Each structure stands twice: as C-alpha cells, then as structure tokens.
C-alpha cells in the first residue's frame, strides 16, 4: 500500500539532508509508515551517522508525504575518498483487521542508500562505470572496479541483448575492489548496470588479449 519514489538513494555529502517521497496508494484505508536505517550489514542503527525522520507517521488513504534523511556529526568518521553503504527501510502498518481469523501481510521495502562524500561528488554528466576492467580468467572474468563508487552489475553477455536478457547473478562491487564471476567467453563483452537514477545502461568492451576495457 505504501510506496516509495525510487529504487536507490544517493546522499550527496555536500548537503545536510535530503528527502524521499512516499505514498499511500491504498484509497480506502489509512496506514502508518515506519522508516529506519541499517548499516552495511543490514543492522538497524538509531544513533547515526545517518538517520531518518520521522520514525513513524500516519497516511490517510491516497495521502502523499515524505521521509527526511539527515546526518549527525559522526558522519566525519567515515572515509572521505569513497562511498559508504547503508540501507533505507520503509514498512507499512495496516489498520487492525475488521474480520476474524485473518493473517495480515505488511509490505516492507529496503533499498541501497549510498553516502557519497563531497570529496568524491561527481559531475551529473560523468560515468565512472566505463573505467571497469574485465580480465578473462579460468571460468569467467575478474571484474575490476577502480572507482570510489559502488557498482551494481546486472548483466554480462556476448551481445547487447544477451547482457540485458541473459540470465546472470547480480553482483555489487564495493569501491576500489575486484570480484570474479563465472561465464562463457565473449569476443566482444557487453555489461549492464544500474546507475544513480535507476537507468540500466549497457557497456560495450574491447579486449586486448585477456584484458578488456570500454570502447
């Protein structure tokens, strides 16, 4: 019943706070909306460095509102040359059931919340994803992410369509790291990812031996 306006949230460290729009799409019943933050290990945290307000609020049917994400002074303890990962949670609370013998199911939504320090703020027309490197190895590719940002890879194929249609286990690369995935060998690799806005671009690679980079 209670929906969110995006699939991930990027918190520009240069700002003090930001907001997310939520909506009670149910037209007959009022719902309560709980919001909270979890750290990188999905452990709920209530004392920072990032918080959500209000923790709970009421939404009349069809009502629109929002949740504010703010930082505390401890936000400075985080590394400033790379992103830190948090999770935003939104759980609804339907009104008690009016009928007898009922199992109520409440929806909850969890999305990745990327804290991006001002030191690594990007230019809205910048694509750090094309810095990724694919090294052919036994059984697949060793994917390198030399950037300070997390990268969510959703596709990897021999063609554009294969990269976006092909069955692939999604993996998210932490900043400045590498990960190895199993997959067939492709003469011209194509990789798909999800960017800041939910866009799903596809990257075409050119290989120099076992080393492949963006064309």
């Amino acid at each position: 019943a209670v929906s969110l306006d995006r699939t991930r949230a990027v918190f520009d460290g240069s700002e003090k706070s930001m907001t997310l729009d939520i909506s009670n799409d149910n037209k007959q019943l009022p719902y309560l909306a709980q919001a909270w933050i979890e750290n990188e290990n999905q452990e709920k945290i209530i004392t920072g460095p990032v918080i959500a307000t209000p923790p709970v609020q009421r939404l009349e049917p069809g009502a629109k509102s929002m949740v504010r994400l703010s930082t505390t002074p401890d936000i400075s303890k985080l590394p400033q040359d790379r992103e830190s990962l948090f999770y935003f949670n939104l759980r609804e609370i339907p009104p008690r059931s009016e009928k007898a013998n009922v199992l109520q199911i409440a929806l909850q939504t969890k999305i990745k919340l990327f804290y991006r320090p001002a030191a690594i703020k990007t230019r809205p027309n910048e694509v750090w994803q094309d810095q990724l490197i694919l090294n052919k190895v036994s059984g697949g590719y060793r994917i390198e992410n030399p950037t300070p940002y997390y990268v969510t890879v959703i596709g990897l194929g021999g063609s554009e369509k294969q990269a976006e249609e092909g069955e692939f286990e999604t993996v998210m690369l932490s900043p400045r790291s590498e990960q190895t995935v199993k997959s067939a060998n492709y003469n011209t690799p194509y990789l798909s990812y999800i960017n800041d806005y939910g866009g799903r671009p596809v990257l075409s690679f050119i290989c120099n031996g076992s080393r492949c980079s963006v064309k």
């Binding site: 019943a1 929906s3 969110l4 306006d5 995006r6 699939t7 991930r8 009670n24 799409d25 149910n26 037209k27 019943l29 759980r91 339907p94 059931s97 009928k99 007898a100 013998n101 009922v102 199992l103 109520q104 199911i105 409440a106 929806l107 909850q108 939504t109 969890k110 999305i111 990745k112 969510t152 959703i154 976006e164 249609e165 999604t170 998210m172 999800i194 806005y197 939910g198 866009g199 799903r200």
Partner: protein, 123 residues
C-alpha cells in the same frame, strides 16, 4: 526514478469460519500483483511479527493466537523467501499461502489473529 509498483490492496489472508475440530491444516491464499516498467529483479523475504507457538523446523511461521500457528509460503515455497524476475516490462504475481496448526495442537480456539512482514529487497 521509481521502480516496480505492487498493488495497493490490503493483504489479508482470510480463513473465514473455522471450527475447533476442523481448523488445523486449513489453507487460504492471497495474490499480490507487481507492475514493473522495466525488466527487473526482486527478492521477497518473509519476516515474523507474531511469535510461533510451536516449532516448525526450517518452515516459516507466525502465531495466530490461542494455541494456533500458520506456515506461510511465497509462490509455493515454505522456506521463507523467493525471487521474481521480469524479463521485460509488465505485471507478475506473487502468491502468499497460509496453512494452519502444526506439531502439538493443544489449542484453545477463539478468533485467530496474526501477522508477518513481506520484505522486498531491491538491487
């Protein structure tokens, strides 16, 4: 820019009239619709609010009160989770099932009420 949109209807699995004699092993389901405008992937996880009166091994369960439990399933799985994939834009359905009692049913019937959380983790 926003993602898939689940139907807004309230999710209530209704078992209706139930007799203290023939109440256990009952079954009732609910269907949640999800519309995505782009190919997508969603992981669904059940979480328990009401604590289970009995033990059910690996199966997920919640408490319905008065000595009664319920084994909740998603898309036919009793494990506690499942993932749905959209190979293209469109609407896909997630079914929630609810089977009653289990173990040592030394109940004390009288209007059952319970609840669980259906979590959606988005990549």
């Amino acid at each position: 820019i926003g993602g898939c949109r689940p139907s807004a209807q309230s999710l209530e699995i209704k078992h209706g009239d139930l007799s203290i004699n023939s109440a256990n092993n009952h079954y009732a389901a609910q269907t949640l619709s999800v519309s995505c405008d782009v190919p997508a992937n969603i992981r669904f996880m059940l979480l328990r609010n009401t604590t289970p009166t009995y033990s059910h091994g690996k199966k997920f369960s919640v408490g319905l009160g008065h000595g009664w439990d319920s084994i909740v399933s998603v898309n036919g799985v009793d494990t506690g989770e499942t993932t749905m994939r959209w190979y293209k834009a469109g609407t896909q359905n997630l079914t929630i099932g609810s089977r009653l009692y289990g173990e040592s049913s030394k109940i004390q019937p009288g209007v059952l009420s319970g609840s669980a959380t259906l979590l959606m983790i988005l990549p």
